Design a protein around this ligand. Structure first.
Ligand SMILES: *[C@@H]1O[C@H](CO)[C@@H](O[C@@H]2O[C@H](CO)[C@@H](O)[C@H](O)[C@H]2NC(C)=O)[C@H](O)[C@H]1NC(C)=O
Ligand SMILES: *[C@@H]1O[C@H](CO)[C@@H](O[C@@H]2O[C@H](CO)[C@@H](O)[C@H](O)[C@H]2NC(C)=O)[C@H](O)[C@H]1NC(C)=O
Ligand code: NAG
Ligand code: NAG
Ligand code: NAG
Ligand code: NAG
Ligand code: NAG
Ligand code: NAG
Ligand code: NAG
Ligand code: NAG
Ligand code: NAG
Ligand code: NAG
Ligand code: NAG
Lengths: 713, 96, 192, 48, 384, 96, 48
């Protein structure tokens, strides 16, 4: 697209000093208020009303302070280190714009002045790869196509474009020796017509002075109404591109961010930098501008409450608190007084527990040497207690069909089995329909019937001419008949699933001509007759592989050739959620030290319901496996006092402390810090937030069980 | 001392249009549902029987009016006992 | 469809008014065949006498007994709060009646594994061999849900009939007569 | 004591799997897999 | 009830009359989606595929599919025929050069380097995979030199071979490394990373046959508010202001389809949404182009109750919870005899009671102590 | 009593989405990979139906036991003796 | 009381027509288009 006239001339120098902007005097912490649905993207699926639903998506963490960015106004401009700090665009972020827009302002460059605060729209540079500026080696340079969000029109328009930022060489510009930071100036002193109607391209012109915009895929802009209300801006990326969210879109008087733009940036965005903004206000009309806060978006479960007008008025961060877990489990913002069993909504990072037995390598050499057998006389290879490399076998063939049953072709190369059976024979891919399940014809009847009792895969492959270890046979031969000629005649014999034909010994003599018949006299006086169809092999020999696998309970010895290390759960990954793959058995679980129990000689221990309960490790230590959500959590809520407490039913308090990486974030924090209302051992489990009071009551609305009552504060 | 007790006598009687509920008036859905037998007719009969039984039970409970002798209670104070809280107020401005 | 109740609220009012007018009676004879026109206050005092309060005490503390009865009837209002168990039972019955309808209506909005919960959407987006399976899945799920609803409705109807029989027993024993049992018509010595 | 003698006989004549109201989550690890109390120890595996 | 001999009572009955339905079509005016980049230049390699996202436009899938010789049209949760007559909130197309002889490597769950390092299909949305051959007549698409796909994409560590795999629908991490094309078969590219490890990729180069072959991955999304991506149809914008009102129609409004009956209704709902839903996701209302809010009901919505007396062999109809005027103006939903009786102003016409509109009844001053036909609310049907 | 038996017998005739309600027909018309799916569909449906039948039978047995206890009470109070209660042994003053 | 718990625990071990009763096993052995179907089958059965 046309980005406009290329910028010419020098840039405006800027003074970079984070020590002025990043001061404790300028810190104005504004945590995310989930009770006000602050920074919540309105879901695009539907517009619900007067109902409370749980939602999984990109949401900010509750009470998140985020990162604060403060901009000043200018001659030489004053800015911070923002242009050189490269943040990580993990799942997107939300921007709180102009929360303070009517209070007193402390200009970071000026002193002893309190101007009314005015909101500012942030400028971003989002890209896939980051690097250094050549003459200065300062980080923050975006290579290749870069997406740039740039406010313009003195604040009434935002520029969004995606293209390569080629640095210039003129002084004070990017890519020069005198380059400090990428600052863009509004210059409202008649250079923006601020007194008149707002219409200018000063911001884009300054950016073009800094960078050369070449090979530019798109360039959109969106009008912004000149207001002073607090705004919310959000950005995320998915397969459909980069999505921009704004509260101004549907109702600037609300707190919900609605989707308003999709940007065709399909490559993954990994980094973003805040472009410093220093506007050129003269001393006659200098102003103190606002600050914007950036909060990272996390994949979280949220309980959203929709107003009667359809807007989200309040939200709950499900994993933040135990009361929040209570609200999300029952999907009720207003929960009555009581004791509730709650679910776990916090997602914690998981390690990996890998224990693989040392085995030799399965040899597919007979499958790759000599002439492949005919279909009726197929060769079978059974593999047990070995390491297979399915990539090695499948890279020597040109696969035409990979039909599979109860398993996927990709999982066939990364899975462990108790056995691996492969039936291979010469087969023309033009006869593919005759090898299909339930197919008619002589192939299934008399040559080979697939056995669908185990996860099985059928591979039709072409042998390339480069592979000279496999010799093409004279022809393709398959049996057309196999019957016993009785007095009435034609007593056809059919293949069992996965078995050989009864005429295999008769057919061992081979067939040289098409429709050649062989007969043998049985001792009962009847004749066993077979007939073979002979057709020539084409340019390339084609084979058929029938791979069948069996999954074991104790040990899947047939494992893929993986260079994974043997992790140790003795100290690390203990009492925490992990994804384990032990001797072919996979799953998620929490491992605890236990005295060796279960049946002897068994690596894995199961209960009467086939749940993996124990595991004997290589280090001689027996471990107990739990489903990664095992400690029962009970929340005691008092509506009148609006106070809550946690009861860990049936669990000792020491084990609750050690097993802390399973509960809400607040519970994890309280278990980390040795708080004086620490875990308390009762007769119904470990209690968090309680004290033994020696008080006797005749009734209670919060019964903990076993003649125990919770007295609200 | 006054002990308060609630004894339910009815439930909300619900009749379901099984054909419309299951198929929403789509010919393909009706043809596919016909393979399940006589489900809708059985559902209708079950609900009709439940509602009929509830009707007979409530009629039996209310039938005590026809064979119960009473006396006209004085409005307000009945002697020295105040029964205004339990009596239906009588106003001639509108309907009873 | 929500069927209307068998009787108008005026008929229920007539039933309760007849119950109130049937309180007074002899309360000392050996059958239900005769009706005595003893007024309400005399009947209450006779019930008190049957409880074990002699006629001398009843004659002495007439106004005191009447005042205590009036205070109890006036304090009957305070029991219509969430703390009372019977009011909780009333609201629970209302909530069960609402919950049946809510489940019946909400079971029509979930896909049950299909691409959509709408038969029209399945017909528009898919073709006979696949749309047949999707519509069959929806049909199977809806049939199971309707069967569960009908079974629960039958259970609720039987429970309501048994509770109506219990209510008739309570009317005959506690309302139309005095109870010499303990705990059938509340704690303490039953009066009226 | 909290049981009369006849209560003691009645409770001893009936087998009930003991639910570990206190420290029962840890008692299930020490005991190991047992068929008699597997349903009690399945609380922390099934999710009830 | 599937019973020839029904006992005396009041029954809730179903609707068995099938009445002809009109069509209510309201389509938004939109531009035409341009598949021009898909039909010009050389198609990109599989690892560097090009993505086209279409929103608020009109597509002609027949025009696009008539220029190609389709060899495979595997679809998921949608039909290839429904891909040309359906409306969507978005339409995403991933296209690249791909040999149809490698068809098995593009299949769901397939093994090999194609899914691992070049392109993994995403199945979170209704998606179609099209393998098509470019005929020699179509000269706007230029055959590339070869077909190139990546065989490896890994970070070389101390232990080595830290393979990087494609996310569903995403690009390979070695895309920037593979920007320089692979001139020879099994050519390897390595890049030094700041961690000290090497990022390595390898490409397989094989010649294009007689005809260039492409692969199209079409994924669609359905919206409940407005499916703006609609096919180019010459369907007129029908008017329900006078006709097709109070009668069953098959509507297709801004991408939302179904059957229903439209009523005049005072505008109630959110002041921006075109469609109105209840708490159970049922289309209840609709704001039309003519500025009138219509009030959608299913084809069978009116509850019909039949009061049958076996002894007299006489029956009557109760329209529960419905006013009689609406019953009259909404007659095209009941049985043929009911429709005839509602059309002609019979003297035993619809009667308004406290339980709904009554057909076949007369107001009476009779007072009874019991009845076998209770209409509810202390009402009894006295048989003739 | 008749309806329980009728439902139990008639739940064996509906296909439950399969090509046929007969296992023999499925085995004859299809092949193992699809035979397993169809037979599994039939098995799932019949298992759900049998579980529902058993639950309903348990409920009916408990109700019949409670009603038998009530019948014993009625025999002891109204038949073997004379009841002074109202409405337990019918309307009016109970005699025999 | 014991049989309710036993049924609740034992309903988590049977496959309901799927290849496995473990969600992890289904995710490891199958791929999204078939994974969704198997997990949906398990979900429907467990919900019932
Ligand atoms: C906002 O974006 C529009 C659309 O990209 C710009 O309008 C184009 O401007 C270029 C030059 O930059 C012209 O070559 C095109 O003809 C314009 N029109 C189009 C593409 O329809 C516009 O300049 C941008 N800025 C504003 C409105 O301030
Ligand atoms: C008898 O009880 C009735 C009802 O409780 C009393 O009437 C109330 O009197 C108060 C005080 O004057 C008024 O505020 C209320 O509006 C009256 N009605 C009700 C329904 O509460 C009455 O005062 C009592 N005493 C007598 C002697 O009749
Ligand atoms: C330090 C410590 O106590 N370690 C383990 C404990 O985690 C476990 O619960 C117990 C069971 O026997 O064995 C011991
Ligand atoms: C003639 C007439 O009354 N037309 C409509 C009526 O059908 C509708 O019910 C009402 C809003 O409820 O608006 C008016
Ligand atoms: C400013 O940011 C740079 C990175 O761009 C960082 O190294 C430096 O410490 C920061 N200065 C501060 C926070 O004063
Ligand atoms: C930047 O890095 C280069 C390469 O190490 C070095 O020679 C140069 O002195 C550095 N500093 C500059 C260009 O200011
Ligand atoms: C950028 O410059 C810094 C100067 O300290 C240097 O350490 C770093 O390696 C450079 N980065 C690149 C990618 O050259
Ligand atoms: C991207 O940037 C790198 C590093 O500067 C450069 O080598 C490359 O040519 C650029 N373009 C592409 C398409 O990778
Ligand atoms: C810009 O695109 C042209 C083709 O239009 C290409 O030749 C050139 O290398 C590109 N320049 C870059 C990516 O810097
Ligand atoms: C600031 O003042 C403006 C103009 O009156 C008003 O719209 C806005 O709500 C006020 N508050 C904030 C936080 O912007
Ligand atoms: C498997 O075979 C491939 C064939 O190229 C080989 O490179 C690799 O080292 C083998 N082993 C693995 C992947 O563990
Ligand atoms: C072993 O099983 C038997 C079955 O009768 C049971 O009685 C016994 O308690 C079990 N022993 C255990 C679980 O240790
Ligand atoms: C779609 O393309 C075809 C190609 O022949 C053209 O004839 C037709 O007019 C186009 N538009 C439609 C079907 O609306």
């Amino acid at each position: 697209v046309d980005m406009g006239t290329t910028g010419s001339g020098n840039c405006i120098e800027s003074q970079v000093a984070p020590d002025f902007f990043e001061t404790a005097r300028n810190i104005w912490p504004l945590p995310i208020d989930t009770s006000k649905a602050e920074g919540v993207i309105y879901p695009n699926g539907k517009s619900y009303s007067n109902i409370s639903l749980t939602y999984t998506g990109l949401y900010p963490k509750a009470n998140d302070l985020g990162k604060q960015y403060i901009f000043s106004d200018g001659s030489r401009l004053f800015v911070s280190n923002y242009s050189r700090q490269v943040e990580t665009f993990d799942d997107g972020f939300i921007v709180r714009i102009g929360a303070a827009s009517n209070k007193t302002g402390t200009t970071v460059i000026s002193q002893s002045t309190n101007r009314p605060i005015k909101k500012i729209y942030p400028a971003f540079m989002l890209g896939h790869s980051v690097g250094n500026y050549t003459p200065t080696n300062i980080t923050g340079r975006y290579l290749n196509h870069t997406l740039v969000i740039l406010p313009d029109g003195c604040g009434t328009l935002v520029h969004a474009f995606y293209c390569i930022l080629q640095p210039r060489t003129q002084a004070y510009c990017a890519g020069a020796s005198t380059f400090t930071s990428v600052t863009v100036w509004d210059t409202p002193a008649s250079d923006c017509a601020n007194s008149q109607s707002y219409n200018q391209l000063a911001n884009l012109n300054a950016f073009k002075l800094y960078f050369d915009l070449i090979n530019c895929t798109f360039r959109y802009n969106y009008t912004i109404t000149e207001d002073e209300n607090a705004e919310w801006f959000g950005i995320t990326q998915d397969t459909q591109g980069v999505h921009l969210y704004s509260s101004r879109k549907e109702n600037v008087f609300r707190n919900n961010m609605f989707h308003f733009a999709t940007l065709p940036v399909y490559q993954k965005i990994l980094y973003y930098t805040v472009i410093p903004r220093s506007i050129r206000s003269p001393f006659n009309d200098r102003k103190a501008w606002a600050a914007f806060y950036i909060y990272k978006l996390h994949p979280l479960t949220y309980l959203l409450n929709f107003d009667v007008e359809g807007y989200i008025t309040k939200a709950v961060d499900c994993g933040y608190d135990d009361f929040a877990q209570l609200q999300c489990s029952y999907e009720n913002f207003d929960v009555e007084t009581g004791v509730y069993s709650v679910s776990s909504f916090e997602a914690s990072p998981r390690g990996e527990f890998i224990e693989q037995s040392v085995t030799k390598e399965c040899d597919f050499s007979p499958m790759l040497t000599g002439t492949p057998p005919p279909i009726y006389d197929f060769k079978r290879l059974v593999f047990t207690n070995c390491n297979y490399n399915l990539t090695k076998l499948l890279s020597l063939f040109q696969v035409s069909e990979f039909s599979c049953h109860q398993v996927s072709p990709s999982s066939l190369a990364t899975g462990c089995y108790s056995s691996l059976t492969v039936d291979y024979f010469a087969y023309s891919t033009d006869m593919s329909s005759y090898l299909q399940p339930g197919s008619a014809g002589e192939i299934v009847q008399f040559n080979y019937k697939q056995d669908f009792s185990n996860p099985t895969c059928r591979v039709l492959a072409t042998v390339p001419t480069n592979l000279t270890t496999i010799t093409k046979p004279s022809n393709y031969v398959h049996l057309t008949e196999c019957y016993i000629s009785t007095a009435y005649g034609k007593n056809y014999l059919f293949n069992a699933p996965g078995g050989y034909t009864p005429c295999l010994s008769l057919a061992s003599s081979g067939f040289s001509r098409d429709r050649q018949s062989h007969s043998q006299e049985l001792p009962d006086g009847s004749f066993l007759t077979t007939t073979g169809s002979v057709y020539s092999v084409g340019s390339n020999l084609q084979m058929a592989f029938i791979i069948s696998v069996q999954y074991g309970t104790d040990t899947n010895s047939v494992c893929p050739m993986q260079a994974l290390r043997n992790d140790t759960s003795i100290e690390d990954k203990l009492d925490v959620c992990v994804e384990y793959s032990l001797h072919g058995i996979t799953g998620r679980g929490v491992f605890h030290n236990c005295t060796s129990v279960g049946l002897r000689n068994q690596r894995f221990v199961y209960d009467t319901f086939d749940n993996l309960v124990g595991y004997h490790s290589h280090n001689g230590n027996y471990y107990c496996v739990r489903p990664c959500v095992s400690v029962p959590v009970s929340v005691i809520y008092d509506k009148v006092s609006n106070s809550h407490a946690t009861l860990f039913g049936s669990v000792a308090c020491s084990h609750v402390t050690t097993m802390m990486s399973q509960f809400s974030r607040m519970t994890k924090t309280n278990l980390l810090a040795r708080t004086t209302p620490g875990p308390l051992q009762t007769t119904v489990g470990c209690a968090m937030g309680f004290i033994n009071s020696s008080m006797v009551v005749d009734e209670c609305q919060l019964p903990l069980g076993q003649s125990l009552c919770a007295i609200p504060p | 001392g006054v002990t308060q007790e609630f004894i339910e006598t009815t439930i909300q009687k619900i009749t379901v249009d099984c054909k419309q509920y299951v198929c929403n008036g789509f010919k393909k859905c009706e043809d596919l549902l016909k393979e399940y037998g006589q489900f809708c007719s059985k559902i209708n009969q079950a609900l009709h029987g439940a509602n009929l039984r509830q009707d007979e039970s409530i009629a039996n409970l209310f039938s005590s009016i026809k064979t119960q002798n009473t006396q006209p209670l004085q409005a307000g104070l009945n002697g020295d006992f105040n029964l205004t809280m339990l009596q239906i107020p009588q106003v001639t401005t509108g309907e009873r | 469809k929500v069927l209307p109740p068998l009787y108008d609220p005026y008929m229920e009012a007539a039933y309760t008014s007849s119950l109130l007018g049937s309180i007074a009676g002899a309360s000392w004879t050996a059958g239900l065949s005769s009706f005595a026109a003893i007024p309400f206050a005399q009947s209450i005092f006779y019930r008190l006498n049957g409880v074990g309060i002699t006629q001398q005490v009843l004659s002495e503390n007439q106004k005191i007994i009447a005042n205590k009865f009036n205070q109890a009837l006036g304090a009957m209002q305070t029991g219509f709060t969430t703390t009372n168990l019977a009011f909780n039972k009333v609201q629970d019955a209302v909530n069960a009646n609402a919950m049946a309808l809510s489940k019946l209506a909400a079971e029509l909005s979930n896909t049950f594994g299909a691409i959509s919960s709408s038969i029209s959407d399945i017909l528009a987006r898919l073709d006979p061999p696949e749309q047949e399976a999707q519509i069959d899945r929806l049909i199977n799920g809806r049939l199971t849900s309707l069967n569960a609803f009908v079974a629960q409705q039958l259970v609720r109807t039987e429970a309501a009939a048994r509770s109506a029989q219990l209510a008739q027993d309570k009317v005959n024993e506690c309302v139309k007569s005095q109870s010499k049992r303990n705990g059938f018509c509340g704690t303490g010595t039953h009066i009226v | 004591k909290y049981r009369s003698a006849i209560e003691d006989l009645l409770f001893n004549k009936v087998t009930i799997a003991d639910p570990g109201y206190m420290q029962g989550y840890d008692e299930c690890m020490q005991q190991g897999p047992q068929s008699a109390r597997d349903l009690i120890c399945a609380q922390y595996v099934a999710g009830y």
